[PDB]
Structures are given as C-alpha cells and as structure tokens.
Swiss-Prot record:
This is Fatty acid-binding protein, heart. The lineage of its organism: Eukaryota, Metazoa, Chordata, Craniata, Vertebrata. Hexadecanoate binds at R127, T128, Y129. The modification Phosphothreonine is found at T8, T30. GO terms for molecular function: cytoskeletal protein binding; icosatetraenoic acid binding; long-chain fatty acid binding; long-chain fatty acid transmembrane transporter activity; oleic acid binding.
Amino acid sequence: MVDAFLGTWKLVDSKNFDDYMKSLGVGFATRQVASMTKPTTIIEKNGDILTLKTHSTFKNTEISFKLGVEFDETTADDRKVKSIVTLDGGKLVHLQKWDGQETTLVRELIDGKLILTLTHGTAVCTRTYEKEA
Ligand SMILES: CC/C=C\C/C=C\C/C=C\C/C=C\C/C=C\CCCC(=O)O
C-alpha cells in the first residue's frame, strides 16, 4: 500500500511555504533560508516501520513510525507534537497535534511526482517532489 511513496525525492516546486511557516510562528530569518532550500526526502520501509528522512543544507529531520500508531515527534521548527500517519484515498496523511493546534502534511502521487500539501490555520502550501533514480 505505501510502496509507490518509497524512495528518494527532491524538491522541484514550492507554493506558499512562507505562508505556512509564518502561520506556525517561524521567525523571518528561518523562513528566509527555508524559501531558498531544496530538501531531499527519503522514505524507506522495513516491515511495518516507515522511516522518513528530510535532508537539507539548513536542517535535517528523521522520523520512524508505524501507520495508524501515534508517535512523539520534534519537528524541524522544534515543535513537540503528537503525530499519526495513515493512508486515506491512497494519500499518505500525517497529522500533528500540539497545544490544541493541528497541522496536516498530505502526500499524494500525481503522474509519478510526490505532491506534499501542508495546511495550518488558513495557510495551504503545495510542494512538489520528483524521484531520484
Ligand atoms: C528538514 C526540513 C527541510 C528544509 C526546510 C528548511 C527548514 C525548516 C524550518 C522551518 C520550516 C517549518 C516547518 C517545518 C514543517 C514542515 C516542513 C516540511 C517541508 C518539506 O518536507 O518539504
């Protein structure tokens, strides 16, 4: 079910990421670097466990999780959140909860590209990733 998401992906398009970061309270200087960074996302599976790495020149993250099982996460911007990832309509849906807030990170495969939609408050950011061979 998750296999078409697996592999190494590089950022090729971003829309409204500054809006998303600002909604989360990220400071100007961090927004400014993040607007010029092109991360690599690596998604791998070992049995039921998925590991999602995000690498860049500015910040790295790594999470491991089982679909449908809550996990603690410390985000790139240092939020301590309660997270869960599932599959819904073929999309990989990641929900983060903290301080009564929520944000969703939804990944959809369209014509072999990985589209990441980030929503917080009213802000909606769309980032497009293409697969590395
Ligand atoms: C490790 C993330 C990689 C590059 C972006 C650069 C800096 C992160 C700092 C602030 C961004 C704020 C929010 C973090 C939450 C989600 C961003 C995920 C973006 C993505 O995977 O393309």
